[PDB]
Amino acid sequence: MRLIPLTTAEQVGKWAARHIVNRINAFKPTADRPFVLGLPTGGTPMTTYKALVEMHKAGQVSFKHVVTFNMDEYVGLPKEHPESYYSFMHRNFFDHVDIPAENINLLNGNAPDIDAECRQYEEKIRSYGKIHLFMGGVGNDGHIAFNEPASSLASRTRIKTLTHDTRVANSRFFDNDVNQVPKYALTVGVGTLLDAEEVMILVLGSQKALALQAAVEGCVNHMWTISCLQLHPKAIMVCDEPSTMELKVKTLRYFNELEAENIKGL
Numbered sequence: 001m002r003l004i005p006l007t008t009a010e011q012v013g014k015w016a017a018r019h020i021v022n023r024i025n026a027f028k029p030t031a032d033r034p035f036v037l038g039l040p041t042g043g044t045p046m047t048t049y050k051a052l053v054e055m056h057k058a059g060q061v062s063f064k065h066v067v068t069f070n071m072d073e074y075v076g077l078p079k080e081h082p083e084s085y086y087s088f089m090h091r092n093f094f095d096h097v098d099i100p101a102e103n104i105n106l107l108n109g110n111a112p113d114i115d116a117e118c119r120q121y122e123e124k125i126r127s128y129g130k131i132h133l134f135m136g137g138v139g140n141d142g143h144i145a146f147n148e149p150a151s152s153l154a155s156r157t158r159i160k161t162l163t164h165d166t167r168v169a170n171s172r173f174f175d176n177d178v179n180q181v182p183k184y185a186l187t188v189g190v191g192t193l194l195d196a197e198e199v200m201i202l203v204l205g206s207q208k209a210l211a212l213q214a215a216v217e218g219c220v221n222h223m224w225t226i227s228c229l230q231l232h233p234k235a236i237m238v239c240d241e242p243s244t245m246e247l248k249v250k251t252l253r254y255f256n257e258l259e260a261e262n263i264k265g266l
């Protein structure tokens with residue numbers, strides 16, 4: 001695994017944005033051979049979305065031949081609701097870039113047949129072949145997407161029941177009312193994520209320090225699903241400073257030596 005120890009959320013956003021752009025440009029995608037990008041929502045990726053839009057506006061990237069898949073979506077939330085992940089993605093990314101609407105893939109949280117919806121999402125991914133870069137965040141409890149504690153490490157896209165802890169955490173988007181937060185979500189699986197060619201996780205804040213420790217210094221286990229990255233051939237974690245507080249000195253020391261040139265940098 002690579003760990004990129006930066007200082008602020010701003011640096012993290014610029015580092016990740018720059019990584020995605022370079023991956024896309026080196027790939028040279030066409031209509032027959034699009035670049036496949038997996039995307040998350042939430043507080044974490046904000047500075048990344050900001051930086052991505054800037055670089056596009058500056059003419060450093062085109063998303064004309066980029067296909068996107070989102071990780072997850074709330075069940076039973078109207079698509080029009082501003083806190084749905086559909087709304088989040090358009091408001092913060094799709095509205096500002098040159099990506100064709102046929103290239104956008106999102107889970108339908110109001111599908112009448114949930115199993116069929118989840119299965120088709122997996123078929124859609126397979127029809128492209130592979131996701132080239134999946135970007136995500138990590139939960140306080142270590143969840144990757146909505147793969148909550150005790151989710152199978154070989155899971156596929158399916159419905160999951162949100163932990164009480166996850167609902168409390170997300171209630172900041174539902175006017176600090178836990179009761180307003182949906183109980184269920186449609187989510188890609190751990191197996192689904194492991195099938196991506198490259199996985200990049202953004203880690204911000206001291207609230208994520210235990211999760212980062214579990215991911216980096218902990219053992220493989222299904223309580224902290226983020227630990228699946230230890231099994232991935234090409235995983236990257238991009239971190240701010242307070243998120244690194246729970247690591248051993250020698251661990252952080254190692255990654256600082258490793259990445260000094262790739263962050264400094266600036």
Ligand SMILES: CC(=O)N[C@@H](CO)[C@@H](O)[C@H](O)[C@@H](O)COP(=O)(O)O
Nearest residue numbers: 042043044137138139140166169170
């Ligand atoms: C609001 C938040 O941080 N809650 C977390 C922790 O359990 C969780 O609900 C999220 O879905 C998780 O992916 C974290 O992403 P963000 O902290 O919103 O960037």
Ligand SMILES: CC(=O)N[C@@H]1[C@@H](O)[C@H](O)[C@@H](COP(=O)(O)O)O[C@@H]1O
Nearest residue numbers: 001002003230232233234235258259
């Ligand atoms: C000069 C150098 O050390 N290069 C390595 C690279 O080969 C590697 O893959 C990654 C470690 O991750 P890995 O052990 O999971 O492949 O770190 C570095 O970027």
